[PDB]
Amino acid sequence: STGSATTTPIDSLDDAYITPVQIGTPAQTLNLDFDTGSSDLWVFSSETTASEVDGQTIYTPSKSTTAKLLSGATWSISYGDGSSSSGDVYTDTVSVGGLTVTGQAVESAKKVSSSFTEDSTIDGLLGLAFSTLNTVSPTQQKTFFDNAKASLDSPVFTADLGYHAPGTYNFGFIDTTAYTGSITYTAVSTKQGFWEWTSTGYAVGSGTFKSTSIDGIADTGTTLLYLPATVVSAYWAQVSGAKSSSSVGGYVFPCSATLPSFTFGVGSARIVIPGDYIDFGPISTGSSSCFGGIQSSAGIGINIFGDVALKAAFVVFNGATTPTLGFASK
Ligand SMILES: c1cnc2c(c1)ccc1cccnc12
């Protein structure tokens, strides 16, 4: 089997991407944030604290004839950005663009943190990292990809995020018309539960490529590209007026600037992120200071190849016996 769904930016900055997901019987369609940096499929629901729901579409397990409460199971997640959510668990039918999983754990939110409530466009998350990170207790649950894997034509999923435009998540197949050239595959470590790989280096604009190992994760659930301080300082040094702002919380630059591109290495291959992809607009409404799309990972503890990097490539999340990541220009 295969599945194919369109993923859409939630706003004009591509802060996140939403993909419609069918849950239950009859189908309840929620727009979820497909996240390769986490492993919980959780949704806003009829059980979420009323004051914490503001515009989101909710999953009502009592209206699904296939929903079964998973006895004694609870979940609780805390994300890298400070957000959190928790609740109980049901098993139900979940479909993504024609691909169906029966008995998928659907984590129903009883509580969500302010940033989830404030984002009316995201009805929940669909985790695509390794099931070892799933927070369901006392019995850990599998991701949608893990549950579907055996049935897929090929044990893979691909991320093709668009820049200011719709894109696609495919399950079970590689669309050879969605990229140019060839896909370069690279080793993945699953030790931390992430799609963790090692970039071979970088270049800023038309500059000399620096060969240096950058260990990081391919994370569709993180907006920006988080890299070592030395790398990020080298990038922003090429932008007149750019500086690290402690008050804003990162590198900012004059909105009138034209940004240089950023290239990252995947083995001997190179992915070029166009400069416009690194512009995240005014730091505050009407400001002429803009927020950078490339930021230091010094405070995080891990480098993150978020949507800024991933949307410049056709990305293969290969769930073969030994998982690997594939990247191609597009
Ligand atoms: C991810 C993280 N931080 C940001 C954005 C996206 C977009 C704009 C912005 C403006 C000021 C500070 N942070 C951000």
* Marked catalytic residue, from 199, 261, 296, 297: 199
Q: How far is the CA of 81 from the centre of ligand 1 (A)?
A: 11
Q: Name residue 42's amino acid.
A: W
In angstroms, rounded to a whole number, what is the distance separating the alpha carbons of residues 178 and 162?
11
* Residue 146 falls in the annotated catalytic set: no
Handedness of CA 54, 58, 62, 67 (dihedral sign): negative
Domain ranges (residues) in the chain: 5-174, 175-330
Spatial contact of 160 and 178, defined as CB atoms under 8 Å apart: yes
Neighbouring CB atoms inside 10 A of 74's CB total 15
In angstroms, rounded to a whole number, what is the distance separating the alpha carbons of residues 165 and 8?
7
In angstroms, rounded to a whole number, what is the distance separating the alpha carbons of residues 168 and 303?
25
Question: What tokens appear for 257 in the block?
Answer: 């600037």
In angstroms, rounded to a whole number, what is the distance separating the alpha carbons of residues 84 and 305?
22
DSSP string, 101-160: EEEEEEEEEEEE-HHHHH-TT--EEEE-S-GGG---BSS----HHHHHGGGSSSSEEEEE
Residue with tokens 């988080």: 226
Spatial contact of 203 and 231, defined as CB atoms under 8 Å apart: no
Give me Rg for the CA atoms of the chain. 20
Q: In what order do the strands lie in the sheet with 279-282?
A: 243-245, 250-254, 289-292, 279-282
Spatial contact of 288 and 21, defined as CB atoms under 8 Å apart: no
Ligand 1, atom 1, lies closest to the CA of 223
The DSSP symbol for 310 reads: H
Spatial contact of 7 and 102, defined as CB atoms under 8 Å apart: no
* Residue 119 falls in the annotated catalytic set: no
Ligand 1, atom 12, lies closest to the CA of 283
Neighbouring CB atoms inside 10 A of 161's CB total 25
Handedness of CA 53, 135, 161, 168 (dihedral sign): negative
Nearest atom (ligand 1) to Cα of 224? 1
Ligand 1, atom 8, lies closest to the CA of 280
Cα-Cα-Cα-Cα torsion 235, 240, 246, 247, nearest 10 degrees, comes to -130
- Cα angle at 323 between 318 and 324, to 5 degrees? 65
The β-bridge relationship of strands 225-227 and 294-296 is: parallel
In angstroms, rounded to a whole number, what is the distance separating the alpha carbons of residues 232 and 295?
6
In angstroms, rounded to a whole number, what is the distance separating the alpha carbons of residues 212 and 208?
12
Q: In Å, what resolution does this model reach?
A: 2.0
